[PDB]
Amino acid sequence: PEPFADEALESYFLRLSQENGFERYRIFSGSVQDWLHTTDHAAAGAFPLELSRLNIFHASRSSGLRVRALQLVDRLTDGAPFRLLQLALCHSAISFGNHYKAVHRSGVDIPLSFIRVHQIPCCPDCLRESAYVRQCWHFKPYVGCHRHGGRLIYSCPACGESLNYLASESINHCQCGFDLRTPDEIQLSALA
DNA sequence: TTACCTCAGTGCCGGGATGTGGCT
């Protein structure tokens, strides 16, 4: 699978597992963690399985060991040493005022508080063209979208069941639900 | 009743969370 220019790190990895047929939990644990362990023990010890936990700004001190795991993937998938690292969210070296935590992604630093940790929404009008969870949704200051007739990002309660893509890793549909093919200022607010 | 006998720091404080070691 090739990465998209605007793709989240977790989206790419989910697609990769699935592309190789590693659809189930047990093989997700396996095709990921056990292979890493058998390369070297450190690539696995630094690598918890749950998806939310995988990104750097969720991590503690042993980041370099997690990076080594990214580097093993870079070899396995015929990559480049920074192909994935250009996508990851890391600890900024810049305080952003009053000792706040701030998070750095290839040139843009966004304060910790604007990261939309829970209830990621989606836009069916773009998902039907290329189905992968995209970046710029994880931002708190971002409702609606550019293009697509505007309107609202279709929000978490799709059908009497809260949605996201991390506690339940499907893109087109989630849990009990279906394939989701379901006021004129926010399109300016959208430009983050 | 009586007689006898001695030398730019620092110091708490909450709270949700990352990670680990033992049992099955």
Short mmCIF file of C-alpha atoms (C1' of nucleotides) in Angstrom, two decimals:
data_model
loop_
_atom_site.label_atom_id
_atom_site.label_comp_id
_atom_site.label_asym_id
_atom_site.label_seq_id
_atom_site.Cartn_x
_atom_site.Cartn_y
_atom_site.Cartn_z
CA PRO A 1 0.00 0.00 0.00
CA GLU A 2 1.32 3.48 -0.66
CA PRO A 3 0.83 6.21 1.95
CA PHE A 4 -1.33 9.19 1.19
CA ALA A 5 0.18 12.70 1.34
CA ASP A 6 -2.33 13.53 4.10
CA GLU A 7 -2.57 10.13 5.86
CA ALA A 8 -2.35 9.40 9.59
CA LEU A 9 0.21 6.91 10.78
CA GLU A 10 -2.46 4.61 12.21
CA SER A 11 -4.47 4.61 8.99
CA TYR A 12 -1.52 3.37 6.95
CA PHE A 13 -0.77 0.59 9.38
CA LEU A 14 -4.35 -0.55 9.51
CA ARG A 15 -4.48 -0.69 5.76
CA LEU A 16 -1.19 -2.57 5.60
CA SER A 17 -2.29 -5.33 7.95
CA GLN A 18 -5.53 -5.74 6.07
CA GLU A 19 -3.90 -5.60 2.65
CA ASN A 20 -1.82 -8.63 3.58
CA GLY A 21 -4.91 -10.38 4.90
CA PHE A 22 -3.96 -9.97 8.54
CA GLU A 23 -7.56 -9.06 9.37
CA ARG A 24 -8.12 -10.77 12.73
CA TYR A 25 -7.02 -9.71 16.18
CA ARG A 26 -4.79 -12.67 16.71
CA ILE A 27 -2.97 -12.23 13.44
CA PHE A 28 -2.80 -8.48 14.06
CA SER A 29 -1.09 -9.28 17.30
CA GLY A 30 1.08 -11.79 15.47
CA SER A 31 1.99 -10.39 12.08
CA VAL A 32 2.94 -7.29 13.99
CA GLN A 33 4.41 -8.03 17.44
CA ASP A 34 5.82 -11.55 17.12
CA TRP A 35 7.57 -10.81 13.85
CA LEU A 36 9.10 -7.74 15.52
CA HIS A 37 10.14 -9.84 18.51
CA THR A 38 11.90 -12.30 16.23
CA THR A 39 13.83 -9.51 14.53
CA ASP A 40 14.97 -8.28 17.90
CA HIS A 41 13.41 -8.25 21.38
CA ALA A 42 13.43 -4.42 21.76
CA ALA A 43 11.20 -3.72 18.75
CA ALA A 44 8.42 -5.69 20.52
CA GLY A 45 8.97 -4.62 24.14
CA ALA A 46 8.45 -1.03 23.06
CA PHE A 47 5.39 -2.01 21.02
CA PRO A 48 1.99 -2.40 22.67
CA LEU A 49 -0.72 -3.67 20.34
CA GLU A 50 -3.72 -1.43 20.90
CA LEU A 51 -3.93 1.15 18.13
CA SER A 52 -4.36 4.34 20.16
CA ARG A 53 -1.19 3.51 22.11
CA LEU A 54 1.04 3.16 19.02
CA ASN A 55 1.80 6.87 18.34
CA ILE A 56 4.76 8.73 19.81
CA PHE A 57 2.97 11.49 21.69
CA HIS A 58 1.22 8.79 23.69
CA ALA A 59 4.58 7.31 24.57
CA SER A 60 6.95 7.63 27.47
CA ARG A 61 10.77 7.62 27.52
CA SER A 62 11.73 4.62 25.35
CA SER A 63 10.86 6.29 22.05
CA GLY A 64 14.06 5.29 20.26
CA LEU A 65 13.17 1.63 20.64
CA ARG A 66 9.73 2.28 19.17
CA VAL A 67 11.45 4.04 16.29
CA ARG A 68 13.62 1.02 15.71
CA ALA A 69 10.39 -0.86 15.15
CA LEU A 70 9.38 1.71 12.56
CA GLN A 71 12.76 1.18 10.89
CA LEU A 72 12.22 -2.58 10.66
CA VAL A 73 8.98 -1.88 8.78
CA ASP A 74 10.85 0.53 6.50
CA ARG A 75 13.04 -2.35 5.47
CA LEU A 76 10.27 -4.96 5.19
CA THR A 77 8.06 -2.69 3.10
CA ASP A 78 10.82 -1.48 0.72
CA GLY A 79 10.93 2.04 2.13
CA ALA A 80 13.13 4.96 3.06
CA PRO A 81 14.40 5.80 6.53
CA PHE A 82 12.00 8.75 7.04
CA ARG A 83 9.00 7.63 5.02
CA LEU A 84 6.99 6.95 8.17
CA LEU A 85 8.71 9.41 10.43
CA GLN A 86 7.46 12.29 8.32
CA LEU A 87 3.97 11.20 9.40
CA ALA A 88 4.31 10.62 13.21
CA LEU A 89 3.28 13.07 16.00
CA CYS A 90 6.12 13.69 18.47
CA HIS A 91 7.02 15.80 21.53
CA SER A 92 7.78 19.36 20.55
CA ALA A 93 10.98 20.91 21.73
CA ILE A 94 8.93 24.13 22.04
CA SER A 95 6.88 24.84 25.21
CA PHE A 96 4.22 26.97 23.41
CA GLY A 97 3.90 29.19 26.51
CA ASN A 98 3.49 28.61 30.27
CA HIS A 99 5.13 25.08 30.02
CA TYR A 100 2.15 23.63 28.01
CA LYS A 101 2.66 20.32 26.27
CA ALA A 102 2.66 20.76 22.48
CA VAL A 103 2.85 18.16 19.71
CA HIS A 104 5.06 18.29 16.55
CA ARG A 105 4.31 16.86 13.08
CA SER A 106 6.79 17.71 10.28
CA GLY A 107 6.79 21.43 10.78
CA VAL A 108 3.51 22.24 12.46
CA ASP A 109 3.14 22.25 16.22
CA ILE A 110 -0.31 21.92 17.70
CA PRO A 111 -1.02 22.32 21.43
CA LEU A 112 -1.99 19.10 23.27
CA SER A 113 -5.49 20.39 23.91
CA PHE A 114 -6.51 20.56 20.27
CA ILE A 115 -5.95 16.89 19.59
CA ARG A 116 -9.34 15.23 19.12
CA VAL A 117 -8.51 12.14 21.08
CA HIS A 118 -11.99 10.59 21.12
CA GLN A 119 -14.92 10.30 18.69
CA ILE A 120 -13.20 10.81 15.30
CA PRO A 121 -15.82 11.85 12.73
CA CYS A 122 -15.75 11.25 8.98
CA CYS A 123 -16.88 12.71 5.64
CA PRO A 124 -18.62 10.08 3.43
CA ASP A 125 -18.24 12.33 0.38
CA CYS A 126 -14.54 11.87 0.41
CA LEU A 127 -14.49 8.37 1.89
CA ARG A 128 -16.22 7.01 -1.15
CA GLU A 129 -13.32 8.20 -3.31
CA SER A 130 -10.45 6.83 -1.27
CA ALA A 131 -11.22 5.00 1.90
CA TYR A 132 -8.58 5.64 4.54
CA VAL A 133 -8.93 7.68 7.72
CA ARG A 134 -7.31 10.95 6.80
CA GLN A 135 -5.45 13.59 8.74
CA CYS A 136 -7.03 16.96 9.80
CA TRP A 137 -9.96 15.22 11.46
CA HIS A 138 -8.03 14.68 14.69
CA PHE A 139 -8.18 18.42 15.24
CA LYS A 140 -10.62 19.95 17.68
CA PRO A 141 -10.86 23.22 15.81
CA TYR A 142 -12.22 21.62 12.66
CA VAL A 143 -15.88 21.09 11.97
CA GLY A 144 -17.27 20.56 8.49
CA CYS A 145 -14.98 20.50 5.46
CA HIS A 146 -13.69 22.29 2.44
CA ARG A 147 -15.39 21.05 -0.80
CA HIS A 148 -18.07 18.36 -0.96
CA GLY A 149 -20.92 20.87 -0.62
CA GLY A 150 -19.54 21.68 2.82
CA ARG A 151 -22.05 20.79 5.62
CA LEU A 152 -20.99 18.84 8.68
CA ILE A 153 -18.51 16.05 9.14
CA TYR A 154 -20.79 13.11 9.85
CA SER A 155 -20.40 12.88 13.64
CA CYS A 156 -19.99 9.84 16.05
CA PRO A 157 -23.54 8.47 16.57
CA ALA A 158 -24.03 7.11 13.10
CA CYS A 159 -26.82 4.75 14.13
CA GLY A 160 -27.49 4.51 17.86
CA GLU A 161 -23.97 3.28 18.57
CA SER A 162 -21.03 5.63 19.14
CA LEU A 163 -18.34 5.39 16.44
CA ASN A 164 -14.54 5.81 16.03
CA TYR A 165 -11.82 3.85 14.15
CA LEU A 166 -9.51 2.94 16.99
CA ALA A 167 -11.37 0.81 19.51
CA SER A 168 -13.05 -0.86 16.36
CA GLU A 169 -10.70 -0.82 13.31
CA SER A 170 -12.87 -0.67 10.24
CA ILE A 171 -13.10 2.14 7.74
CA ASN A 172 -16.32 1.91 5.69
CA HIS A 173 -18.55 0.50 8.44
CA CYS A 174 -18.24 -0.01 12.16
CA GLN A 175 -19.62 -2.60 14.59
CA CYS A 176 -23.38 -2.94 14.13
CA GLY A 177 -23.56 -0.27 11.38
CA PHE A 178 -23.53 0.00 7.63
CA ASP A 179 -21.21 1.22 4.92
CA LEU A 180 -21.49 4.90 5.64
CA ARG A 181 -22.74 6.46 2.49
CA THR A 182 -25.50 7.97 4.53
CA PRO A 183 -24.58 28.20 8.95
CA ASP A 184 -21.83 29.30 6.59
CA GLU A 185 -18.76 30.13 8.68
CA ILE A 186 -17.16 26.79 9.57
CA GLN A 187 -15.74 26.37 6.07
CA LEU A 188 -13.42 29.23 7.06
CA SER A 189 -12.66 27.65 10.47
CA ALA A 190 -11.88 24.50 8.50
CA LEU A 191 -8.66 26.08 7.21
CA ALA A 192 -6.30 24.55 9.78
"C1'" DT B 1 8.17 -10.40 144.10
"C1'" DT B 2 13.26 -10.00 143.53
"C1'" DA B 3 18.54 -10.25 142.25
"C1'" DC B 4 21.86 -10.50 138.57
"C1'" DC B 5 24.73 -9.19 134.87
"C1'" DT B 6 27.90 -6.10 130.74
"C1'" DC B 7 33.30 -2.56 128.06
"C1'" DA B 8 13.05 32.26 35.78
"C1'" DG B 9 13.25 28.67 39.61
"C1'" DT B 10 11.37 25.50 44.11
"C1'" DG B 11 7.43 22.63 47.14
"C1'" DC B 12 2.56 19.91 47.34
"C1'" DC B 13 -1.55 17.76 44.78
"C1'" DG B 14 -5.08 15.49 41.73
"C1'" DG B 15 -5.96 11.97 38.15
"C1'" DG B 16 -5.82 9.24 34.36
"C1'" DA B 17 -2.52 6.35 32.26
"C1'" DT B 18 2.04 3.38 30.66
"C1'" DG B 19 4.25 -0.28 31.84
"C1'" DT B 20 5.55 -4.36 34.45
"C1'" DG B 21 5.71 -9.22 37.10
"C1'" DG B 22 3.26 -13.56 38.70
"C1'" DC B 23 -0.41 -17.15 37.89
"C1'" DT B 24 -2.82 -20.27 34.72
#
